[PDB]
Amino acid sequence: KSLSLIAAHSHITGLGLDENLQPRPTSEGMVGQLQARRAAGVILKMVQNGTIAGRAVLVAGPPSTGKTALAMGVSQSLGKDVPFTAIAGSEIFSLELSKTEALTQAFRKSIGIKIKEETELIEGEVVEIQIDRSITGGHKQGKLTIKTTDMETIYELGNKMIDGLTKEKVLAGDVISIDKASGKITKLGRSFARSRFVQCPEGELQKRKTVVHTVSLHEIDVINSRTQGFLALFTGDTGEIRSEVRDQINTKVAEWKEEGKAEIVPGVLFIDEVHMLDIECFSFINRALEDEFAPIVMMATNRGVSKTRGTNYKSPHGLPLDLLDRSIIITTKSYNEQEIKTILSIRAQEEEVELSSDALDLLTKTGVETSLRYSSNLISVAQQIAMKRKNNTVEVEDVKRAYLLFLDSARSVKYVQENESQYIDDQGNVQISIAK
């Protein structure tokens, strides 16, 4: 499941921490930033305890210094069944939803409800189906022989089971699963009879299976609101859900919690590029954190003393001081040459690229010279130059060829500045002719 080619954070499998919340130097694909990893482990234990709500954590640092990778490590270490909503800053500027409504829907997608229920199923391999019908079809008599590897039985069939069996046509040798109460019959395939292919079930025919459901609060809000059905969870046109239905859902969840029929799980809402939000969104977030049904919010930004959007003054991190008073700030740092070399080694092993040692030294030098992401991007295009001349290992001259072909930012800025007459400036003045 979960198809994926290769991501930019695909080498991260979680936070590398021991039992005493101390970071290993290199574990689970994360290198360096020991204080940030320890703080994120503390935040992970805050989420896993689940006894407090509505805390804001800000991750700030220079660009391309492990900011989104920390959130990916936290999300991988969180595990399944716990919600994790990752949105961007500019995603809430909708055309059919207000900004506060989009923020409310993002907030209420990170709180789950755990419900455990048990059902009865009949799963086995069909041996023989005998159906007797009349001329007009008024009455039908049926016999079905079904089996597992441990038992054999024959069932006398009713009318509705006969109609549910001629629909979704089953034959001998099929493996099917029958729910008695709902009448849903699912064909799991054929058994191991050559005469898709599924091994025959074992044990008892009638098993009692318990499944654990995890339903977000937003789904119950959409379902309980009678204006739209459950299809609005897929089409997306919920359209400004009112507040009384949310109050009813909150009271009913609090009522279910006392009787033990349900459990509250909290999640993490991750807002990447939080500086793109407007001032009214910040004012809504200032009051959305003071509720019992609120998740733990992680925000990331790289702005330093920038202009707040929707205002005319400059604020630290692009955020007003009311939001900064409610938050605790984790600061990330820049990397040395050894961290860059280790990260490039991990990215080389992820992309199945064999690198020579001198090519790794050249990539580390051009990584500490210009950027980490440029040297990370150079590997996958140097491998194609390596394969073009029919060679497996990436050599020094392949990295030099990739450096010659694809430019970085600092060289392109200089090449623009020396030849400014050939490009369109801010005044729309360009020169296209070569002569004169």
């Binding site: 022989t145 441990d150 054999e152 039985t153 024959i154 044990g203 008892e204 025919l205």
Partner: protein, 51 residues
């Protein structure tokens, strides 16, 4: 009429297709119902008059 297992007297969910004896679960079928001697099935069915 309610259906009961012929061996134990518990609730008989299933019924063997060979000798038409109702049984309760898999262990009764594997140990008693399937490797049973001939002629005992009719004496089992004699109790509820189904021979």
């Amino acid at each position: 009429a309610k259906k009961y297992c012929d061996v134990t007297g518990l609730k008989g969910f299933y019924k063997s297709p060979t000798n038409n004896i109702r049984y309760h679960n898999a262990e009764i079928y594997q140990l008693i119902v399937k490797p049973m001697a001939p002629g005992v099935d009719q004496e089992y069915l004699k109790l509820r008059g189904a021979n």
